[PDB]
């Protein structure tokens, strides 16, 4: 079991930072109490997502080196990863360890919330696939951090600067792959695979949106801005 001190430090730091903010209890239990309605579900789901985004900007604001980047690039990294990051969380939430609590009920709200079962089917297929990988909090944390820290996002001016910040996360996740699952591996390769996949999911997501209707309810200001519309 390798893992240098520099690497363990990054991991401990990232892990710390990863579990700080957390979703507000109000919005959370809002899926237990309160009930159905495609429009009510649509509002809850959209309320959380707006939350998630907020938590996400804080997490990446304290990712090693982030504030050191050009200000425009930071925006681009955020706008560029908000959706994909959301996918990773969705994955984390859905598969692995069922605390016999609200999460299985969240799936229900998602089903019939004005979302085409022609979209939820493949999407949930994906989450179940990433599930097969039997990932840990740490793997989810690093993936989220490397997803956010992608030098190949459409508008960044200085990609090397972002690279310097992402490689360390990449080196760690990989070494972490040998450790937890050496039986194969390929696992690290496959993990990076899912990272390319959800990039195409971002595309479908953008399309499913303009057809997402529910009565006439609108998304929150932030979402309209980050999800584009």
């Amino acid at each position: 079991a390798e893992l240098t001190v520099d690497q363990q430090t990054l991991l401990d730091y990232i892990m710390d930072s990863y579990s700080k903010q957390r979703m507000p209890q109000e919005i959370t239990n809002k899926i237990l109490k309160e009930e159905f309605s495609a429009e009510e579900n649509f509002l809850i789901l959209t309320e959380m997502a707006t939350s998630h985004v907020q938590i996400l900007v804080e997490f990446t604001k304290r990712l090693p080196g982030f504030q050191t980047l050009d200000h425009e690039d930071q925006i681009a990294l955020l706008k560029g990863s908000a959706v994909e990051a959301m996918f990773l969380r969705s994955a984390e939430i859905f598969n692995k360890k069922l605390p016999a609590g609200h999460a299985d009920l969240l799936e229900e709200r998602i089903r019939k919330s004005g979302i085409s079962d022609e979209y939820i089917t493949p999407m949930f297929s994906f989450y179940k696939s990433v599930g097969e990988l039997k990932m840990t909090q740490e793997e989810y944390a690093l993936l989220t951090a490397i997803v956010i820290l992608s030098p190949d996002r459409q508008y960044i001016k200085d990609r090397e600067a972002v690279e310097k910040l992402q490689e360390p996360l990449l080196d760690v996740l990989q070494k972490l792959c040998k450790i937890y699952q050496p039986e194969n591996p390929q696992h690290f390769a496959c993990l990076l695979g899912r990272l390319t996949e959800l990039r195409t999911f971002n595309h479908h997501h953008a399309e499913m949106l303009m057809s997402w209707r529910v009565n006439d309810h609108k998304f929150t200001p932030l979402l309209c801005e980050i999800w584009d519309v």
């Binding site: 900007v57 925006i75 955020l78 706008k79 932030l222 801005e225």
Partner: peptide
């Protein structure tokens, strides 16, 4: 423009 995002990045 991303005015909201910007605002969340500078003082939250």
């Amino acid at each position: 423009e991303n005015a909201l995002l910007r605002y969340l990045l500078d003082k939250d």
